[PDB]
Amino acid sequence: NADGDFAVTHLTKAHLFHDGRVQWTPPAIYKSSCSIDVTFFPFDQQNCTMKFGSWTYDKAKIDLVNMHSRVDQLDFWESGEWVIVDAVGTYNTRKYECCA
Amino acid sequence: ETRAHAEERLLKKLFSGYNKWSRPVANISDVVLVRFGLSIAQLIDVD
Amino acid sequence: ETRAHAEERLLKKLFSGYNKWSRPVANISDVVLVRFGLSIAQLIDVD
Amino acid sequence: TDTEERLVEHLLDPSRYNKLIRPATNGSELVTVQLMVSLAQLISVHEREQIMTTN
Amino acid sequence: TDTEERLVEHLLDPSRYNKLIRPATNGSELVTVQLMVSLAQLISVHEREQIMTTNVWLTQEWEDYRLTWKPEEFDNMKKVRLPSKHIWLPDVVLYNNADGMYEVSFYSN
Amino acid sequence: TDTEERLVEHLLDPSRYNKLIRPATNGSELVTVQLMVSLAQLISVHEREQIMTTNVWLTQEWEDYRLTWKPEEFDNMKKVRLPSKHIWLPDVVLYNNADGMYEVSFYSN
């Protein structure tokens, strides 16, 4: 995060099913930092990333699953300035000095 | 008989002994699998 | 005898059966006359 | 009025009116919502940032 | 400490204290509020729109006779912290403000 | 888990736990807070307005004797997650902030 919120703040309603499934799809505006390479500007290609994860639950308590590798663009409002070439999520694990 | 009344009964039962601060697993060794995905509405700005 | 005890009694009595969502008229046909006025503290900007 | 406050207390009584629940009847029937937009003012169009502001 | 919990629960007991009542005894006496502004920093002066921004502490002192206790009955405690939302306050604010922000920032203890 | 939620209800019960009171025993003893800053990113340095913007993780560690339990009574549970808005916190803030934002951004468990 960079100049924005860390977590979701809108808190829409969740959709609860009878077998215990919970579906929650809130909107969010994120301002994330990404290093910008302008070697070939204005013919440049930028590669900006977004890292999401649980803050206080480790892998033994909460684990993430890719709903689908590619970012969904069925409802995407075209910008007119940039075109998305590729948007894919990668699953990672790792240890921090904070926590065991 | 109306769907609203049945939903009211269901809401009364579901949250009777519910704790929103506790991880929702039957067994402590269980893990909560969260299916996570992104859907982009628009690309507001690349500063 | 102290003003504070009288004020506490008054507050208890005023809001015992008071409903803030209902137009406060004794009779339904009555109109609530609201005296309205403005006092300008400063003209911040004219854009 | 005493009658009006009695009615408003009766209608919104949380014991028998839950505002979280759709006012649905006849089981799988749906609630019909009529929408109509009235435009009071077109405050501005900002071409640079591509935003329209309306009241 | 447990004594501090007991004291806090005793002072704010609603059966003997509600914040909506001014703490005036002797009929028509007034509450004397002592004000002292301390300047943390002069953030900026914007001459174009004629606005001065400052960071300050708005020290306020008054006497509320309803918040008294005997120290020997509470392990000799001489002072305690109460949330300012739960006690009567003087609603002292800045009148010549621009941007329409009157009140203090945080409402500390 | 049923045991976990029983424990969490027990710990955060406002009847027995008051989050506005410092977890000090024996009267005038003090609470020690361990502080460690981890720098995740230097976002910018604005020379014109003289502001440095940083993304940091502020480690805080302390003891609260009121938030203890016996593991044997709670299915050998050793630790739990509690919402930071419902327990006593030491109000450690960035004192020399610009823009008057003293607190942290997220308030995690």
Ligand SMILES: *[C@@H]1O[C@H](CO)[C@@H](O)[C@H](O)[C@H]1NC(C)=O
């Ligand atoms: C973009 O960056 C990510 C992470 O550094 C990398 O996995 C990916 O291959 C990059 N894509 C391109 C086209 O360079």
Ligand SMILES: CC(=O)OCC[N+](C)(C)C
């Ligand atoms: C336990 C806790 O608060 O961890 C925060 C830091 N993180 C996300 C790197 C583990």
